[PDB]
Amino acid sequence: ARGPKKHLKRVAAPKHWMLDKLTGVFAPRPSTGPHKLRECLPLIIFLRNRLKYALTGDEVKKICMQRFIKIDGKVRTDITYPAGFMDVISIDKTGENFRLIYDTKGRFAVHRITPEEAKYKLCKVRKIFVGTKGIPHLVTHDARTIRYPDPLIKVNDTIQIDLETGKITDFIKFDTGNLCMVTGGANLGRIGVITNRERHPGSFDVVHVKDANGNSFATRLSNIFVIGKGNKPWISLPRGKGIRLTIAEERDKRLAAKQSSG
Amino acid sequence: NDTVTIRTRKFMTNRLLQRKQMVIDVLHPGKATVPKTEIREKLAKMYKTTPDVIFVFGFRTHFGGGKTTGFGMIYDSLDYAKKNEPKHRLARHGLYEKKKTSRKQRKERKNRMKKVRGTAKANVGAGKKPK
Amino acid sequence: VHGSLARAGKVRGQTPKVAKQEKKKKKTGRAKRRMQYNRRFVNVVPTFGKKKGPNANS
Amino acid sequence: GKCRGLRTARKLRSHRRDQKWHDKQYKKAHLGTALKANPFGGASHAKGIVLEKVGVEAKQPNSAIRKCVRVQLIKNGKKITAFVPNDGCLNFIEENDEVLVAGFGRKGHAVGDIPGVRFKVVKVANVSLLALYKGKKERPR
Amino acid sequence: PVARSWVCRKTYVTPRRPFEKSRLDQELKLIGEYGLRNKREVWRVKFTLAKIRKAARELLTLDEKDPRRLFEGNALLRRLVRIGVLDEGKMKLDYILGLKIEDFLERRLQTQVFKLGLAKSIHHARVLIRQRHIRVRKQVVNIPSFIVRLDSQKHIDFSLRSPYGGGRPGRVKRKNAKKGQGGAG
RNA sequence: GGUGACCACGGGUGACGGGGAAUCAGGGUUCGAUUCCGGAGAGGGAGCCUGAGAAACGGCUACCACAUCCAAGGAAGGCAGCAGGCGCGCAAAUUACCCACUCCCGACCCGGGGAGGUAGUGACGAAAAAUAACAAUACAGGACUCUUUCGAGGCCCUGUAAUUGGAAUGAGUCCACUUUAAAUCCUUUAACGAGGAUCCAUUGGAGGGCAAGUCUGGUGCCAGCAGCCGCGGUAAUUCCAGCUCCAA
Ligand SMILES: [Mg+2]
Ligand SMILES: [Mg+2]
Ligand SMILES: [Mg+2]
Ligand SMILES: [Mg+2]
Ligand SMILES: [Mg+2]
Ligand SMILES: [Mg+2]
Ligand SMILES: [Mg+2]
Ligand SMILES: [Mg+2]
Numbered sequence A: 001a002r003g004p005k006k007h008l009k010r011v012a013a014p015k016h017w018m019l020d021k022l023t024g025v026f027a028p029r030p031s032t033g034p035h036k037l038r039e040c041l042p043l044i045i046f047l048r049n050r051l052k053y054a055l056t057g058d059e060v061k062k063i064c065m066q067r068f069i070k071i072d073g074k075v076r077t078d079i080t081y082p083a084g085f086m087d088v089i090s091i092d093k094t095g096e097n098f099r100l101i102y103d104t105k106g107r108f109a110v111h112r113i114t115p116e117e118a119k120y121k122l123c124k125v126r127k128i129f130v131g132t133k134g135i136p137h138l139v140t141h142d143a144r145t146i147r148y149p150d151p152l153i154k155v156n157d158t159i160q161i162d163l164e165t166g167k168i169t170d171f172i173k174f175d176t177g178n179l180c181m182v183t184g185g186a187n188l189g190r191i192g193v194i195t196n197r198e199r200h201p202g203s204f205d206v207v208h209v210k211d212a213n214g215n216s217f218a219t220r221l222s223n224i225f226v227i228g229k230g231n232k233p234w235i236s237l238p239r240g241k242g243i244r245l246t247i248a249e250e251r252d253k254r255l256a257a258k259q260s261s262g
Numbered sequence B: 001n002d003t004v005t006i007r008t009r010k011f012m013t014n015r016l017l018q019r020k021q022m023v024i025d026v027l028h029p030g031k032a033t034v035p036k037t038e039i040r041e042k043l044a045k046m047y048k049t050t051p052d053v054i055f056v057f058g059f060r061t062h063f064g065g066g067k068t069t070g071f072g073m074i075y076d077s078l079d080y081a082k083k084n085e086p087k088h089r090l091a092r093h094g095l096y097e098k099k100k101t102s103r104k105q106r107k108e109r110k111n112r113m114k115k116v117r118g119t120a121k122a123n124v125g126a127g128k129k130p131k
Numbered sequence C: 001v002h003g004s005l006a007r008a009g010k011v012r013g014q015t016p017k018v019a020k021q022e023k024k025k026k027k028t029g030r031a032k033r034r035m036q037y038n039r040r041f042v043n044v045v046p047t048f049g050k051k052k053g054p055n056a057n058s
Numbered sequence D: 001g002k003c004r005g006l007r008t009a010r011k012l013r014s015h016r017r018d019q020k021w022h023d024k025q026y027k028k029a030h031l032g033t034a035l036k037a038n039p040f041g042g043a044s045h046a047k048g049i050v051l052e053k054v055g056v057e058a059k060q061p062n063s064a065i066r067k068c069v070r071v072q073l074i075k076n077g078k079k080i081t082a083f084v085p086n087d088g089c090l091n092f093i094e095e096n097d098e099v100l101v102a103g104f105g106r107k108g109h110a111v112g113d114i115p116g117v118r119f120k121v122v123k124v125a126n127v128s129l130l131a132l133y134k135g136k137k138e139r140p141r
Numbered sequence E: 001p002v003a004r005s006w007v008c009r010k011t012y013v014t015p016r017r018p019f020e021k022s023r024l025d026q027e028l029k030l031i032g033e034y035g036l037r038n039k040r041e042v043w044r045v046k047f048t049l050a051k052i053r054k055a056a057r058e059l060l061t062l063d064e065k066d067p068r069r070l071f072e073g074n075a076l077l078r079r080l081v082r083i084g085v086l087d088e089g090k091m092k093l094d095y096i097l098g099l100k101i102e103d104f105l106e107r108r109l110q111t112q113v114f115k116l117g118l119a120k121s122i123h124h125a126r127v128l129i130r131q132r133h134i135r136v137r138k139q140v141v142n143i144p145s146f147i148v149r150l151d152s153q154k155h156i157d158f159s160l161r162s163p164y165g166g167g168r169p170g171r172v173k174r175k176n177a178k179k180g181q182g183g184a185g
Numbered sequence F: 001g002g003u004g005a006c007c008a009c010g011g012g013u014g015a016c017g018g019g020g021a022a023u024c025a026g027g028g029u030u031c032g033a034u035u036c037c038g039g040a041g042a043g044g045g046a047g048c049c050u051g052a053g054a055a056a057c058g059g060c061u062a063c064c065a066c067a068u069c070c071a072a073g074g075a076a077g078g079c080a081g082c083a084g085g086c087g088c089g090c091a092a093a094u095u096a097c098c099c100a101c102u103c104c105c106g107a108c109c110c111g112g113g114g115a116g117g118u119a120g121u122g123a124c125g126a127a128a129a130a131u132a133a134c135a136a137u138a139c140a141g142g143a144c145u146c147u148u149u150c151g152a153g154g155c156c157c158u159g160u161a162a163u164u165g166g167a168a169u170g171a172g173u174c175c176a177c178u179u180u181a182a183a184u185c186c187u188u189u190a191a192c193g194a195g196g197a198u199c200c201a202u203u204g205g206a207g208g209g210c211a212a213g214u215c216u217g218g219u220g221c222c223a224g225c226a227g228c229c230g231c232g233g234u235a236a237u238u239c240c241a242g243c244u245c246c247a248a
Helices: A057-066 A245-260 B037-048 B078-083 B085-093 B103-115 C008-014 C030-039 D010-022 D024-031 D033-037 D129-134 E022-034 E040-060 E067-082 E092-099 E109-115 E122-130 E172-184
Strands: A070-073 A086-090 A096-099 A118-130 A136-140 A145-147 A156-163 A167-172 A179-181 A191-198 A204-209 A216-220 B006-013 B018-027 B053-062 B066-075 D045-059 D064-075 D079-083 D099-103 D119-124 E132-137 E156-158
Touching: A216 B006, A245 D079, A245 E067, B018 B037, B037 B053, B037 B066, B066 B078, B085 E067, C030 E022, C030 E122, D010 D024, D045 D079, D064 D119, D079 D099, D079 D119, D119 D129, E022 E040, E040 E067, E040 E092, E067 E092, E109 E122, E109 E132, E109 E156
Parallel strands: none
Antiparallel strands: A070 A086, A086 A096, A118 A136, A118 A156, A136 A145, A156 A167, A179 A191, A191 A204, A204 A216, B006 B018, B018 B066, B053 B066, D045 D064, D045 D099, D064 D079, D099 D119, E132 E156
16 A cells, blocks of 8 residues: 555454444544554444444534543544543543443453542553653553653553543552453453563563462463552452353353343 | 334433433234324323424334334434434424435536636536536 | 258158147146155055056056 | 385475376366367357358267268357257258357267267357257247 | 345255165155155255254264363253253253254144144145244244244244134135125125 | 575466365365455556655656547547446446445535445345145045945045135235335235136156156158267157156
8 A cells, every 4th residue: 555544344343342244344443542453442333332322423423522522531522532441431411431441251341430430540651761851751551651750660560540630649560469451362351460470581471360260371461451459459340350251151140140030 | 093002122311412212112913014103192192202303213014013113212302303313314304404406416516616717706607507 | 071961850840740738737846746745655555566667658 | 115204295295296297187277288279268168150061970880960060269260060969950050150159068078979079059140059949939030 | 345244055955866766755755744845945954953963973072071062062952952852851962863854844833833733734734824824922924944942832823813813804705705795685 | 605406597377365265084176356454556668746655647747559629730648446338258237326324534513425335237146935725525545444355434545527615825906104315125004916726837857877658659870869888770668749757
């Protein structure tokens, strides 16, 4: 091609969006933003496919124009704005807020939150460096950067950010025994506790995680998002408590739930 | 009229678009498909809403008659109904008029205006002769 | 070429023309299968013949 | 015998593809000479213009005159012989006719008692020969 | 470009060899027994058992204690005992390999309405269903090959609109009645 | 110096590559122009302007080849975009409607989009499924049954021809609703709408392979059939016909 693309095909859309093959040829094609296109929900398929607020694409355009959808403290009029991982989606008219956390199957699940919970939001620092005049900057897994951080934050760590100030309320050091979350790969959307980290010079580091049920798994270091201070998470967990159950026991889960409600 | 039951499910009101969205399944046992007017007034009577703001669309009759499923949009004000709706639904009730020309003549008109440059009388008078 | 092509289409033309007779309309589909299933299965033959075929031209 | 070493796979694959040039099926479809020599050019059917009507003696056990036509295909201009497969369908052919010839059924090979004939005419003058034989439709007069 | 699907499969497989007197008689016995229109729909039920029995065989060759074997094996058991082709107590993979096609063919709607007394003849059952007279639960069905499950077996009845349950007499009865009342009072 | 029998280099390709498709014990054998991803190209080459991004072609410049209007002084081209023509061929659709859905562009809730959707042709192909069922008479048949052939009916199953013969439905006409951007089709639903229910099922065969005729009439190694064996020269299980059967 002679330049950047601006169309995404429906089939070429990310799998976790749970889009269907028949309604349209194309896909939302989220605009550039804080997060990559492979791990973000455009607002169109959050208000039309998740909450069913809009029936087609023109209604979600109209409601974005009416300026009630406030992402992360700021209004967003873009129909295909990339929401991304654990960003606050506040609708002030309904008085309800949302947190975009992967479920146990690695998909962005609808997760309502309390108004006091949405006043803060976690982030994962990606690169630490110092700019001009000896002013340390600190970029995060979003496109955000903040000046003058606490020197006790290193790379691949976690920072608590309270909204409308952009200040570090507190910090979580990426360490053994601290509750984390997988953010990619096969084990995407799993909640566990770090047990070991092996380092490979010049290659991707590999961590080992053991969850509450004793199930152990591994993933690359770039797929680690520490959220809990040791064992207590700093964010309300989604339904299911972030444990991946095998194919066997959701069958009897549905069977027993159907029998109990029938 | 003896047996026309109108049930609704999946109901939810969104104050985002100032409307209450619901899917309605009518049940006419041996009658034909019920027209949208009768659905509109009965649904309005159930919700104590005025029978000029209710919208119903997409009615699919099940096999052998009886159940027929449609989608209903009820609004808290007719002004909001004119504010945010597809133009074809507003045109069905007559609130919006779409008496236009066909798209082909519009495309001929536009490409005719490309030739004439800038003249405030002929860039708009380009289609006066080829109507 | 030897050119014995003048005899082309000789026997076909020589055939005496007889018109197709008028018969009952044959059943189709499930009726056809019903007719032939009852023809060859639900029947008991006391007569011998070593199970002669359906088109015995005796 | 045959080699069975752990690293004789190059020899095994080279001998196999060298020996695959010795059966007629692989050689016909891969050398390309058969494709270029095929009167149909690799097509199932072809269209030609009738040049003449000829008779071919049957093989030795049989005895008849088999009615065929010399056909010059419009594409690649190759002259072939096309059997006319019915009792009186040669008379439906006249000179200079657009005939749709096809193969006989064993991949460019003579069939039955007809020597040196590999094609049979299927349509003549843009109407099916079988339709003319059954009288379903008339000649385009 | 297009948004179409074109995801389609063949539901039947033609026999490997044609023209066997033993096989043709076996199929013609089934067609007369269950009132099937053509051999394609005795081939499709043969193919249904062909794929079902194949999957059970593949599962049985699997290693014991395999979660795939347990989950998939009990999965197809559940739908097999749902449609009633297998006994409730016979919940084993090995006994699936002994299943036939006759017990599948009696799960058809046409054979079920005939076997439940709603039709006097098997061929009468197919014409009754195709004429929109029968119903299952509260949904009218006009497919003779409509399979039935245990929870739907006891709900088979005439439709409300047919001239065998509720009212709505047929047009020949209406024309005959209007013939009688016009010629005499 | 570098590469080569561990095949360089050169030639061909009826070669765009892959995800994939067909066949299916295992191993394998072919096909992937074709809707997803990557590449390339805009009649063939070449060179540039602008722009973040082009060696852009629904941008420009020049040559080559085709081709357009002209008052002959000039000027204007790029359908391997959607339609539609010619030609090429064995081989493939309407010079239709609409941005209502999916998305894209824009200064933008408001405009545009032959992307795309909708309809038309459409037997590539795939799924379901009409062309009939029942009853009462005959004449048969049943382990039939009643005395143990003999006669009947306290029963069961096909068939042939009949005022049967009155029950049931679509396929179509077509009211309305529905669907839809507006229509169309589908689904409902009025009212008409079947007794040769002529509202007519066909395509291939009947020597074997391979299911089904050593029936009848013509022809007479002729005409023809026949994938292979083979039939046909005056009594054709095979040609051409009628009748009857077989396969789907
Ligand atoms: Mg090429
Ligand atoms: Mg390809
Ligand atoms: Mg491509
Ligand atoms: Mg290019
Ligand atoms: Mg720019
Ligand atoms: Mg160029
Ligand atoms: Mg018919
Ligand atoms: Mg014959």
